[PDB]
């Protein structure tokens, strides 16, 4: 049975960073590394398992996460580093065994006046535990005075929408990220 890789890579509409998408991969024979030849992905770094003998191995289980980041945050999708993307939106464990893929989507997720449909968390009260998703749009309490649900002085909205005009530098360009994690179980994925 072929794997539905086009349902994740070639999906019509894509998730934000604070609300990253998810897709479970099982019961298929998967053609890894044939994607490596395609020129769209500007990053195909893999950890623990070399990206060449992927086809010669089988894993009990595979996890796929799809989201959209900007520019100078592709280096943030990796183990062992800090920052607004890594500490508040998506954190990776130090003992990561999988791959990281990202490609440019200039003509899809960017418009001249700005595509404000992509969000990311910039406020948080604690760091992001490895492999955690934060969806709460509750107002962050920055000072001693309680926010009480009204956003104003020392009371700011936790999310900020990516500005994202195509006329800006590619350090702000769309970069659709696809993360695969590799873990009994049946034949699983091979």
């Amino acid at each position: 049975n072929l794997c539905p890789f086009g349902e994740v890579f070639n999906a019509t509409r894509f998730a934000s960073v604070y609300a990253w998408n998810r897709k479970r991969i099982s019961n298929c024979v998967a053609d890894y590394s044939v994607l490596y030849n395609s020129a769209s992905f500007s990053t195909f770094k893999c950890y623990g398992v070399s990206p060449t003998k992927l086809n010669d191995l089988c894993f009990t289980n595979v996890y796929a996460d799809s989201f959209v980041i900007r520019g100078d945050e592709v280096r943030q999708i990796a183990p062992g580093q800090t920052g607004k993307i890594a500490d508040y939106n998506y954190k990776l464990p130090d003992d990561f065994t999988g791959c990281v893929i990202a490609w440019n989507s200039n003509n899809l997720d960017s418009k001249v006046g700005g595509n404000y449909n992509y969000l990311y968390r910039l406020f948080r009260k604690s760091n992001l535990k490895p492999f955690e998703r934060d969806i709460s749009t509750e107002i962050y309490q920055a000072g001693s005075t309680p926010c009480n649900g009204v956003e104003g002085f020392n009371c700011y909205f936790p999310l900020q929408s990516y500005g994202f005009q195509p006329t800006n530098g590619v350090g702000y360009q769309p970069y659709r990220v696809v993360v695969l994690s590799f873990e009994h179980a049946p034949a699983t994925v091979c």
């Epitope: 019509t12 509409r13 998408n21 969806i135 179980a185």
Partner: antibody, heavy 124, light 110 residues
């Protein structure tokens, strides 16, 4: 401070129609999948259906027993989820719960936010 | 379709005893199983997910295990607030229906 409020339940003649609304508060309902679960009086939990995220194009699956009578919809403008029911009969007299559980979508960690339930009663 | 059977339907125990609850499936579901608890007139709380991992905030006395078709919920130490009904649920695919268990009403012994 994440809540889930439902409404719309009431007396319904058999074979009529009713629409329920699960309103999300404190978070955007369009990002995560939404589950509908019902339970009759003194009976066990009965899974109704599920709507997916906006990213997954709002996929709908329903139980076999609810063949062609139930439809799940949502409204991103009002941050609410809908439950459509046709051809009502005594199996449907139950307390219906709206819940958002991100773990059943094969995630790792999440939160179990539930609603208060809306009693739907079918009378002749 | 997959039907879940909970055994037993009800049992009685005092405070501080170890209690086992079994949830058997028709077809092998791998590890997609969740456990719930429901107090009277109350919304169910999520307890165990993926059959082994604890939810944030529930006390450590709860423990779950199992794989394939046999699954177990264990309370190492019973307490007055844990005496309610429990349900098991399987995820097992994004395209086929999801099902609950028959329930296991846990009552006190006096």
């Amino acid at each position: 401070e994440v809540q889930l409020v439902e409404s719309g339940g009431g007396l319904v003649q058999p074979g009529g129609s009713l629409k329920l609304s699960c309103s999300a508060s404190g978070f955007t309902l369009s990002d995560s999948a939404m589950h509908w679960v019902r339970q009759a009086s003194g009976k066990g939990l009965e899974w109704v259906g599920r709507i997916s995220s906006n990213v997954n194009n709002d996929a709908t699956v329903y139980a076999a027993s609810l063949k062609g009578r139930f439809t799940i919809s949502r409204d991103e403008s009002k941050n609410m989820a809908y439950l459509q029911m046709n051809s009502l009969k005594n199996e449907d007299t139950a307390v219906y719960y709206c819940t958002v559980v991100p773990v059943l979508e094969y995630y790792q960690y999440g939160m179990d936010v539930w609603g208060q339930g809306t009693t739907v009663t079918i009378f002749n | 379709d997959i039907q879940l059977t909970q055994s037993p339907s009800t049992l009685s125990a005092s405070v501080g005893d170890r209690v086992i609850i079994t949830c058997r499936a028709s077809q092998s579901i791998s590890t997609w199983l969740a456990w719930y608890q429901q107090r009277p007139g109350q919304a169910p709380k999520l307890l165990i997910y993926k059959a082994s991992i604890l939810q944030s905030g529930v006390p450590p006395r709860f423990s779950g295990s199992g794989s394939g078709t046999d699954f177990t919920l264990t309370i190492s130490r019973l307490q007055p607030d844990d005496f309610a009904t429990y349900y098991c649920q399987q995820y097992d695919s994004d395209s086929q229906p999801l099902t609950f268990g028959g329930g296991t009403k846990l009552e006190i012994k006096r």
